[PDB]
Amino acid sequence: YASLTEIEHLVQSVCKSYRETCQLRLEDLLRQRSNIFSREEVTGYQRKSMWEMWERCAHHLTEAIQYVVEFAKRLSGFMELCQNDQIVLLKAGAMEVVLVRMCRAYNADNRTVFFEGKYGGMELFRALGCSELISSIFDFSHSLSALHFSEDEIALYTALVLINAHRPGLQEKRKVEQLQYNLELAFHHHLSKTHRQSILAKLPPKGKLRSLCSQHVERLQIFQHLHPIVVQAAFPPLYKELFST
């Protein structure tokens, strides 16, 4: 039964773990907002091969995932969990955390995302041949951007995205449930201080993040079946492990 002091300490700990592993500075992402891909640059990306565009994106996603792994490692409660459960949570949660974090790189005013040094719209990704997935991801980013998360809110929310006791295959489910609840208390406490509990009802349903990850896996199946050799030869091995069937 975590005391108020312990909950306050948990807030600080989660926010520190996030700050240390957030990958890019928010200020740098925001500074780059005026730097938008030109019509010709966008066309250049659209004319790339499906395999090359998938390869680029898999690399960038894997890099983002490596920071999420580091985030998990610095979350004290996470390392308290058994080895199996750490793996189960990260395997299911890594992509979900990245999707949430990416809203920092999304500009709702022109519906663009920071990708390879500049801001581009969803049409930038057309060569992937998964327009429905890209649209869904942009919709998700837009929905989160409307919430106007602070960095501390992103820290606390992403901690909860990772510590999700509903994942199948947990060996110590009740232990994960306790940590999840404590992180809920931390999140709620922080929100209470800033009069921000209103956002709780506006957060995406958990099924949404699960849906996006399922869609991603399915589109990778379509790609991998079409181009099996490129996945084997060129894609990051961690990407394969997490997403290939």
Binding site: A72, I87, K91, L238, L242
Partner: peptide
């Protein structure tokens, strides 16, 4: 697995 390796266990 690679997650195992990255987590150091």
């Amino acid at each position: 697995t690679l997650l195992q390796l990255l987590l150091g266990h």
